[PDB]
Ligand binder design. Structure first.
Ligand SMILES: C[n+]1ccc(-c2cc[n+](C)cc2)cc1
Ligand SMILES: [Pr+3]
Ligand SMILES: [Pr+3]
Length: 392
């Protein structure tokens, strides 16, 4: 007898899935030093784990939304959960870092199911008032994962093997599979209809023609790249770069991702009395000053990692205050299907993350902290350059 508890279990398991796909990245980065050392791979493969994971995350959004609309939101979502489980277990059999990285890419495809079909079902199932509550919980999980992940991941690889992490990801996903199997409704409104890739290609051609949309989408990518670059490389900057331990590594996540949360909590308070664009200008100050301080500090003094951390913290506060607003404006910058717009901007900004982490990596390998931070400053400037057009 499940109908009252169904209204709560369905969003909970999707959030559990969202959480485990997220720590599936955030727990793995600290443990990536163990992985590299166990394959004898070289530290340059540490950020590439995330690069491949995110590259998979942009692989199928365009398809999965309209496909699940045609064949069912249940069978497509459940397939994504199974896929994550199977690919999480398959990585234990990887014989080199290339195979590890390749499965890391296959595991990344699991992210595409969250918004394009999972959240689509939340939109199609719940009232606007309840939908807001669920979206908020999804946002709170997206804030906790990149703080919990590195802390728990650093602690994990001093007692347990990295393999065990993937067992944990598959287990949490397995729990969410059984929960979704019982509780998820079937809310696809086009079951039976034919899907036309040629027609769908025209939809994505039309959104890319929208100048104001593309400007906002790229800006979201550019502005979050410093934060994503830090997540990817902080294990190699702090531990192998600065010759520090796991404690320092983990400790330095607190002011940065704490600052992110602080930026979101203030946004929540200030939202009723500030327009979206004023919050973008408001948050722009800590973003620019933060990135500028981190750059200036590590150019004049290469090993000033506390000044770098403080710079990223001030920057992160700006991101928490500005991003949610810019996401909103970008969505409504294109008067086209919300499924296509969301998939487009999710896809576009992740193109920037994947390429950006790779350039970021080479910046640090060839120039250390100074060139790592300077590249992050360029990204801020590119976000700011786009904002003066996008806003004025
Ligand atoms: C799959 N995925 C999750 C979270 C982000 C994300 C990007 C930028 N920020 C600021 C937060 C979260 C991107 C992709
Ligand atoms: Pr058409
Ligand atoms: Pr269409």
């Amino acid at each position: 007898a499940r109908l009252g508890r169904q209204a709560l279990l369905f969003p909970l398991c999707l959030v559990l899935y969202e959480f485990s796909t997220y720590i599936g990245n955030d727990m793995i980065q600290p443990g990536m030093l163990a992985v590299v050392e166990q394959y004898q791979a070289g530290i340059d493969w540490v950020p590439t784990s995330m690069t491949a994971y995110l590259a998979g995350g942009m692989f199928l959004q365009w398809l999965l939304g309209p496909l699940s609309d045609r064949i069912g939101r249940r069978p497509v979502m459940l397939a994504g959960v199974v896929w994550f489980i199977v690919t999480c277990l398959a990585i234990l059999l990887a014989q080199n870092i290339e195979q590890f990285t390749l499965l890391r890419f296959l595991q990344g495809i699991s992210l595409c199911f969250i918004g394009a079909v999972g959240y689509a079902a939340i939109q199609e199932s719940f009232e606007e008032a309840v939908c807001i509550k669920i979206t908020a919980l999804m946002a709170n999980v997206a804030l906790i994962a990149p703080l919990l992940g590195p802390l728990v991941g650093a602690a994990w690889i001093h007692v347990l093997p990295w393999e065990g992490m993937f067992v944990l990801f598959a287990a949490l996903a397995a729990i969410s599979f059984f929960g979704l199997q019982r509780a998820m409704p079937e809310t696809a409104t086009r079951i039976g209809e034919k899907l036309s890739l040629k027609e769908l290609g025209r939809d994505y051609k039309l959104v890319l023609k929208n100048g104001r949309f593309v400007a906002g989408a790229l800006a979201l990518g550019f502005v979050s790249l410093p934060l994503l670059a830090w997540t990817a490389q902080s294990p190699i900057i702090i531990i192998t770069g600065e010759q520090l331990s796991s404690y320092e590594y983990g400790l330095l996540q607190v002011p940065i991702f704490g600052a992110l949360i602080a930026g979101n909590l203030l946004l929540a308070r200030l939202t009723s009395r500030r327009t979206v664009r004023s919050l973008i200008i408001m948050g722009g100050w800590p973003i620019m000053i933060g990135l500028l301080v981190a750059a200036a500090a590590t150019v004049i003094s290469s090993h000033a990692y506390l000044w770098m951390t403080a710079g990223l913290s001030i920057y992160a506060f700006g991101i928490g205050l500005a991003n949610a607003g810019l996401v909103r404006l970008t969505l409504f910058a294109s008067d086209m299907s919300k499924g296509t717009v969301s998939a487009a901007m999710e896809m576009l900004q992740m193109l920037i993350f994947t390429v950006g982490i790779e350039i970021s990596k080479h910046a640090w390998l060839n120039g250390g902290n100074g060139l790592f931070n300077l590249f992050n400053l360029v990204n801020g400037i590119l976000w700011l350059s786009l904002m003066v057009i996008f806003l004025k």
